[PDB]
Design a protein around this nucleic acid. Structure first.
Lengths: 158, 80, 134, 83, 199, 123
RNA sequence: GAAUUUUCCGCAAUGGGCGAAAGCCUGACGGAGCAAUGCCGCGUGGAGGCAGAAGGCCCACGGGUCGUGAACUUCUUUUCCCGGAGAAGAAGCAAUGACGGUAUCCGGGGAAUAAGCAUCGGCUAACUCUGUGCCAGCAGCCGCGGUAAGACAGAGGAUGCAAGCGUUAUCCGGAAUGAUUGGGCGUAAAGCGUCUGUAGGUGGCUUUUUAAGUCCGCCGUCAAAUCCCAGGGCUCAACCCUGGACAG
């Protein structure tokens, strides 16, 4: 029971001496609004078959988003994947999802209803939709920072 | 010289009337060096700060018609 | 050379955790010994001790790593200097940075001594912001 | 009154000394220190202070249009270039 | 124009959801089609059609709504909910939920023709914000009209919203407190409308 | 980023700025008399007979202007009023003509755009 | 010149000049007039009404749509109009006003007097049929037109906004495309051909001291009015206003 939506249907064509043929590509993102996303890129001859294969690749690369709070992000994070750079900042329980055309499509599925961002560098829908995934994977919460951090011998509780 | 009265800030029918501490050689509604208190005509709002008055009047300040009457309407300026 | 000894420790620990090493040896100075003290009180490292190589005094700095994975999670993800030599940053009681919303801290040298992000707010003092650890 | 310190660069003037005041101040838009140096024409009726001496300048009565400052004390001796 | 005049149930159709511009009309849209599968609406279409649903329900303009969403953004508290606070406090909307008028466009005419009294004094303005503990009642002269009598004859049986309390005999309704999220029964997502104004 | 100490020496600041259409001291519209009303051919993708007229402005400059719509009545002594907009198909033409003002008449039997082209309301 | 107004009324109110006063002078000013120049509010109708009437547009002509839209019916009538009352801005103080047939209030006719503009290929939210047919024309950019082009011209319909709409001009934003917060220089624009070196920038480690920078607190000033927070008054709002905050 996951929600499915398309980002961009790109037209990629190569010319041979045998004519002009194309293999359509589509980016589909999945989600259940509880804090679970997954992007998928699939290439096929037709438009309907390119959306189908990208939906099967989306439910395979499943990553958990550690948001769980009052419909917002835990902290500030800046990640750069290639030429594309996206900045994700937390917001108050009244702001909408003021993020990019390829960024808002992955954030509405993550459960984050309150978020503010910017689209820097390259404005390609392929490199920016995956740059937000690398930025959401490196997200830490108050409990897992202290568990990642190796504190010395403190007083042990039962 | 310096004197006491009221300026204009509220235009049209609503004449609010400002505070005072201005010279005679200046404007009707211009520069004011110090603040005191004011009154609103069609309301029960009457301020007029008493520690600011009498402290300004001792050093050559002239009490003109409009600052008067609103002075005796309150508990200040009587045989006390 | 050594233009800033407060900047090379930041580089020596950052490159050491990326290639997962056990012990690093940095130069011995009183101000840098004060930074490694408020690093272990928060828990970013194990401990710090005194050492000597060849008539030169060095400081032992043992790092801490998490559980075993494909690439084990590091204690300090990023280490960067704010008050770089030739661009000295100074802040008051209100201009003190809130790093990661309370998760990470920023170590600053104040007039009362050497305080952190939470410690400088309780005393009501400010100063030169050295670096930020998270 | 304001007090500013500086070194004397020129002494070849009748009862007047050229004092160069160095002042370090951070930029409000940026962060780093920008050094500004302006020379003041100080008064010295006793012609005691020569070239190379670092003196402090206080505000006083204008003896001319360019001169308004006087040199009252002396913190250190000659700190100039060798002949 | 202050309040849209002309075709009312054209916007109850097309949009999918059914608001209260009149009483109750069919689910289906305009033209010969629209009863089948519609085309894929873009990401900017969901932000444009959702704000036009909130703008038409109350019978408010774009110039007046622009102020009620900006002052609510500058004010403290949850922005998404305080848009529906200053919009529900209007004298033309609190009159619909009172049972004195069958719909909202007919409730603006009721306030404009001097039929409603607020705390004893007479108010003509529909865009007037009604603060708590206020008595929204009818006038003694306009108590004998057949339109006001017919609308309040159907009200003693139906249940009115929890933030309001109507007394059927003296024809007066009091407003106790502010309306919250679970108290609103409209088919509108308040997070899609606040995202439109900040493009 | 260019280093902080070079930003005090040089200090980055923009230019004097070049205008797209020199309509004097920030004036929206400008008046002028037409000198020569001729016909010219477009660029490479288009091929038509477009009507362009050389307008002598109030400042003393003689720049070209495009006439919109079907049919006009501009002579050698017509006092016209310019707009200020490029066509990007005809080289040198950076201005447009506002019809329905002064000597420039509006387009006959046009029912669509009446705000532009300068057409009146038909009864 | 693209473009910016009544050669009006008054001292009544506030203020200025003079006078122990009265009072006089006062297009400062208080008001009115012209102009949708902008901001704000209201209005030009409300409910009910057919099995979806004429008449248009599309049509596979079996219909659909414009359309509840209209007509037809009950209903209310702000504002405009007409008539009668009538707060306050006057404190002074033979009771003193320009504005005023003022605000506002009561009543009487009757919906009766009141909407348009742009757009509809994509970004841009909204469709087809004709005519024309790279012809005439469109156009912010990519671009449309050489016979069936939703991007020309008209019509039907739809969308947006509103007495405003559209166009143009101009600054900022989008341009982390000068980036201090925010960018780069092997090949995309970019290390000067290579050294020495003055000014300038930066500078290892220890202790003491200074403490100038810096930091804490406090005292001045940072005019008022904007902006912001909370709270009041014109029926709301615009507007006006108290205190505070801020003035880095």
């Amino acid at each position: 029971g996951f929600e499915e939506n398309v980002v961009q249907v790109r037209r990629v064509t190569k010319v041979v001496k045998g004519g002009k043929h194309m293999r359509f590509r589509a980016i589909v993102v999945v989600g259940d609004k509880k804090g679970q996303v997954g992007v998928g890129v699939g290439k096929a001859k037709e438009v309907v078959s390119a959306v189908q294969k990208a939906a099967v690749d989306a439910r395979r690369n499943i990553i958990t988003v550690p948001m769980t709070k009052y419909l917002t992000f835990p902290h500030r994070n800046e990640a750069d994947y290639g030429a594309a750079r996206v900045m994700l900042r937390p917001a108050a329980p009244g702001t909408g999802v003021i993020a990019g055309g390829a960024v808002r499509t992955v954030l509405e599925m993550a459960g984050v209803e309150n978020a503010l961002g910017k689209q820097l560098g390259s404005n390609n829908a392929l490199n920016n939709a995956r740059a937000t995934i690398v930025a959401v994977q490196t997200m830490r919460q108050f409990s897992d920072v202290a568990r990642d951090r190796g504190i010395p011998m403190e007083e042990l509780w039962k | 010289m310096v004197k006491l009265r009221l300026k204009r800030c509220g235009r049209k029918q609503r004449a609010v009337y400002r505070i005072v501490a201005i010279d005679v050689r200046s404007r009707r509604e211009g520069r004011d060096l110090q603040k005191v208190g004011f009154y609103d005509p069609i309301k029960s709002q009457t301020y007029l700060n008493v520690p600011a008055i009498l402290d300004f009047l001792e050093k050559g300040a002239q009490p003109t018609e409009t600052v008067y009457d609103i002075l005796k309407r309150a508990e200040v300026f009587k045989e006390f | 050379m050594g233009k800033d000894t407060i900047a090379d420790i930041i580089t020596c620990i950052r490159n050491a955790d990326m290639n997962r090493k056990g012990t690093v040896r940095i130069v011995s100075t009183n101000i840098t010994e004060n930074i490694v003290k408020i690093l272990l009180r928060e828990g970013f490292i194990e401990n710090a001790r005194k050492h000597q190589e060849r008539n030169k005094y060095f400081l032992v700095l043992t790092l801490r790593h998490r559980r075993n994975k494909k690439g084990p999670y590091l204690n300090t993800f990023h280490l960067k200097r704010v008050s770089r030599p030739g661009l000295r940053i100074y802040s008051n009681y209100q201009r003190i940075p809130r790093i990661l919303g309370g998760m990470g801290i920023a170590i600053l040298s104040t007039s009362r001594g050497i305080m952190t992000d939470r410690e400088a707010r309780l005393e009501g003092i400010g100063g030169e912001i050295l670096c930020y650890i998270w | 009154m304001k007090t500013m310190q500086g070194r004397v660069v020129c002494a070849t003037s009748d009862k007047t000394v050229a004092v160069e005041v160095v002042r370090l101040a951070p930029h409000p838009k940026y962060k780093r220190r920008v050094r500004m140096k302006k020379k003041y024409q100080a008064h010295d009726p006793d012609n005691q202070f020569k070239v190379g001496d670092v003196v402090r300048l206080e505000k006083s009565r204008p003896i001319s249009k360019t001169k308004s400052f006087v040199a009252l004390p002396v913190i250190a001796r000659a700190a100039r270039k060798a002949e | 124009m202050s309040r849209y005049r002309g075709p009312r149930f054209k916007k109850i159709r097309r949009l999918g959801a059914l608001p209260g511009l009149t009483n109750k009309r069919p689910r289906a849209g305009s033209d010969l089609r629209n009863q089948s599968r519609s085309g894929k609406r873009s990401q900017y279409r969901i932000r444009l059609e959702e704000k036009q649903k909130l703008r038409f329900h109350y019978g408010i303009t774009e110039r007046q709504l622009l102020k009620y969403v900006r002052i609510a953004r500058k004010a403290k508290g949850s922005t998404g909910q305080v848009l529906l606070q200053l919009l529900e406090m209007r004298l033309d909307n609190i009159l619909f939920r009172l049972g004195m008028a069958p719909t909202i466009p007919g409730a603006r005419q009721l306030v404009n023709h001097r039929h409603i009294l607020v705390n004893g004094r007479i108010v003509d303005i529909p865009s007037y914000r009604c603060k708590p503990q206020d008595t929204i009642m009818a006038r003694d002269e306009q108590k004998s009209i057949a339109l006001i009598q017919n609308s309040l004859d159907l009200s003693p049986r139906e249940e009115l919203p929890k933030h309001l309390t109507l007394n059927p005999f003296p024809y007066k309704g009091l407003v106790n407190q502010i309306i919250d999220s679970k108290w609103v029964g409209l088919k509108i997502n308040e997070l899609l409308v606040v995202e439109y104004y900040s493009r | 980023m260019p280093t902080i100490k070079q930003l005090i020496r040089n200090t980055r600041q923009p230019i004097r700025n070049v205008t797209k259409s020199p309509a004097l001291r920030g004036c929206p519209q400008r008046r002028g008399t037409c000198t020569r009303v001729y016909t010219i051919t477009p660029k490479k993708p288009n091929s038509a007979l477009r009507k362009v007229a050389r307008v002598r402005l109030t400042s003393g400059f003689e720049i070209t202007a495009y006439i919109p719509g079907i049919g006009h009545n501009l002579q050698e002594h017509s006092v016209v009023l310019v707009r200020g907009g490029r066509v990007k198909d005809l080289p040198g033409v950076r201005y447009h003509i506002v019809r329905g003002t002064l000597d420039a008449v509006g387009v006959k039997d046009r029912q669509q755009g009446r705000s532009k082209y300068g057409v009146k309301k038909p009864k």
